[PDB]
Amino acid sequence: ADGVGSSSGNWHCDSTWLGDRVITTSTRTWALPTYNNHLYKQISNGTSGGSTNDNTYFGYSTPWGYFDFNRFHCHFSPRDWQRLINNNWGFRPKRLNFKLFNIQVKEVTQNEGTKTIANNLTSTIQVFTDSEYQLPYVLGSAHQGCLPPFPADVFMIPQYGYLTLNNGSQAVGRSSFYCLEYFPSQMLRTGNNFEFSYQFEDVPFHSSYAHSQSLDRLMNPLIDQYLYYLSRTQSTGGTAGTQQLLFSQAGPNNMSAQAKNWLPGPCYRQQRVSTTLSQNNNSNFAWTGATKYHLNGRDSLVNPGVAMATHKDDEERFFPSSGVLMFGKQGAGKDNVDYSSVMLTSEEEIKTTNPVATEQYGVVADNLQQQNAAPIVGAVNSQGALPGMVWQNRDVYLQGPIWAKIPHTDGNFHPSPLMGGFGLKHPPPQILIKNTPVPADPPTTFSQAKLASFITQYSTGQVSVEIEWELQKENSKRWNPEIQYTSNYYKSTNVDFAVNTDGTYSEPRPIGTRYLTRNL
Amino acid sequence: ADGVGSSSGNWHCDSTWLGDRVITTSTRTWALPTYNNHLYKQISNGTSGGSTNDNTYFGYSTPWGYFDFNRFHCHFSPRDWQRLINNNWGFRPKRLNFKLFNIQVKEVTQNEGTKTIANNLTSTIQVFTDSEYQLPYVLGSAHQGCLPPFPADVFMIPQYGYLTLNNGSQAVGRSSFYCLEYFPSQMLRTGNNFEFSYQFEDVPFHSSYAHSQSLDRLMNPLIDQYLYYLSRTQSTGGTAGTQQLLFSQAGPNNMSAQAKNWLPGPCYRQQRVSTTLSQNNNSNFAWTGATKYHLNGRDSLVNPGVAMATHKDDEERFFPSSGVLMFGKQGAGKDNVDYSSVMLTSEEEIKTTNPVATEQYGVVADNLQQQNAAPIVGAVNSQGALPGMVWQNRDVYLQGPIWAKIPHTDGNFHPSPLMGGFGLKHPPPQILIKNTPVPADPPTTFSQAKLASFITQYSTGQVSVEIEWELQKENSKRWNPEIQYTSNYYKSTNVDFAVNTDGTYSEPRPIGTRYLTRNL
């Protein structure tokens, strides 16, 4: 039986590779403080201050914290991630299991300048999952506070808050307020533990691979087509330019002119930025020249956007302004940090099926020609979905988000998250946790006012999350060797994906998921 | 039922990866000519000519050919070899299956200057396996004539011959002569096929991995040893050098002085050669300065020799003269070809457990010291096996031999082939094949002389070899990513391990089998 002298659970970290399943499991140590002195608070920012109209919000910050495991490096070691991306075409999550155990609640008190900390054995914490998704779902925005990548780290649990409809800083009539104490929650003392199990809905495998064929090269290089195209509108070789309609079969000589069954994926253009500083314009175009969308009078930057190739062949240095996911190196500031600190992801692999982010989708005619009027062709900067169009989703990264919640709406088009991930209508429920408030001594004469004086308190414990993953094994007749993800062979001051002299775990580079090839 | 109008078998090339087994299977088209005009012939080379005493031999060349599949690239595509070496610690062969089918026998005749070729439907070929190993076993010497690496190539079957005891060019009394027609053999016409199955004896897994620890670093870096060593024989800091015995515990500061349980593998020194030309001596030392062994008055070069590290840290350019396996690039001559054409293999990975090929094993004392006599320490160039000694075998390569036959002898020490491979007491039997001689028209009057006139004839057909391999899966708790074998990411004129514009299949580099790490 449970008690103060027996542990509620054991430490488990593994990856079990069996057949087409891999079961990854993680355990971390967390510390949950008291947020907002146990208060709900209205929070808002209006345009009255230096804030612009785009940055206005209205919402509430709660006392509650929440667990976020939504990043891959929570569930995978760099070596486990290497087994995955080298040997497999696809993977999808199946089920997860989640546990809290070994909970300590501790009171801390100040006397003059000295601090002291003592166990409080009778205190509780409150934990519930929102199984029914009745709360604003705050996961999937790529917020900080996930379990650390490295298992020996102890992390602080992030505070829960949410945003609601606003006009300026003020709230409208449809604005909702949620009291989290109004759900049923389990209360745990130091001998109690918490568990639940969740099963993922059927979701398509993330495709981890690149195409070994571009979309326009699917043809046989040897053979002509029986179809014809319009090769020349004018008389050739004549002393007069008299117009004449001449047709030709497209063939190995002109492939660009052949008939084709499919079209590249949709395009929404990004502004191109060069890593070489001299090539860029001299100005600040970051916000002004940015690609934005306009929703209810507020312009929101489009980030990262629809999945589009970062750059074309033999341009390494150019990247779309908002187009790529950008990760920071260990110990990087939050504000105006130099380029050397960020790690730019790149989509190389989707150049085959997807247009380049920084270039036009194509060119269409602007006019009806006449013998008098010359033909005019305009560029297509943004192109929605057309029939016969194929595309790839953005690639997941070891540092990136696993899933997002598909908004509940009448309709959606290809509901896959633009940060990359698995779109889920019923994602893993978000787990909320709070220290139960313990009052400081009340007065001896009754007063109606609520008690504003509490014992300063925090809790720690252990958390285990276990996800079963389904694998799609690579089966390929390719003769020559694949590209693999490999560590650098040459010597270095310190090992990649390992602690340094000071004990700081760092991740050198973002690791994409597609090294394998398939036929398009 | 079989006949001239039905095929005897089907084309099969696959690698089936299932569980801990991989079954590789290959099929090739072969052409078997008539060797020695259907004659056995004595062959010898004596010292009377320009030949030296080391190059003398006595033996026989037969009419027979033989099939040799003994190289890995027969059974593995470069991609199948990549799955193997990246994902696995070890592998060993289990059983094989072998087939001849779709046999054509063709007669060719000359009329004036024109050639013509026609099927001969009634002719046979003779095939037997030496199951009992009663013949000189000629496989495992790394001779040419193996099935081509690339399945679309048609290869010529090599002629069978063997060597026997000699004195000079002359034969001694123990010299043996073998008539191959004196075994039972199966005779096949164009509708017949041949098959047999062989099962490998239990053999240790080839170890494909490197050690992540050197043999001398197995210690804990944090903690001292309770053992002592002799640190100083002389008085320190004194105005006199009076000798005094001072002892110390070895620790993190001096690791080289700690007590250790094990010793590096055995050493037989090689001469060191630099790829930089200026650094080498100016002379021809290739034969003279070579490391040789002396057997019955003949000096034989030691090649490649006992497994030893090619070079130490931060020397790329040096290699042992005879120490490394040397493969040629596609289309390289057989004689005095330049360095650019050969591909030098290297053992990097065994630096941990094995001494460097070009350096001394260690140093031992040459004398008993006295107050009068100074201590003298000699180098150990060659070192046999000592108790408490550990070593790694040489690495197998995609281009290298799979197995060798362990000589039948009273005793042997660690019977593993020095070219690398699996030492087998009962290796796969060698398959012998010959065109049955068909006489040209005999005279109409009887003559006792054997018939010297035959119909010029050759045969072609298909050959399938199928080997089941047992795998030892890699199970490792290493956090950071492994080194993997990967193809080059950058653009190139033509793909590696693929045909060029002219249709010539080439292999760019030798591919070793050890990219994974284990703890020593």
From TrEMBL, chains A, B:
Q: Which domain of life is it from?
A: Viruses
Q: Which UniProt keywords apply?
A: Capsid protein, T=1 icosahedral capsid protein, Virion
Q: Tell me the protein's name.
A: Capsid protein VP1
Using the UniProt record, give the first listed, main subcellular location: virion
- The portion of the full protein included here is 219 to 738 of 738
Family of this protein? Belongs to the parvoviridae capsid protein family.
Ranges of residues in domain Coat protein VP1/VP2 Parvovirus: 1-492
Chain positions recorded as beta-D-galactose binding sites: 55
The entry's cellular-component GO terms read:
T=1 icosahedral viral capsid
GO molecular-function annotation terms? structural molecule activity
Q: State where the protein is found.
A: Virion
**Does the keyword section mention Chloroplast?**
no
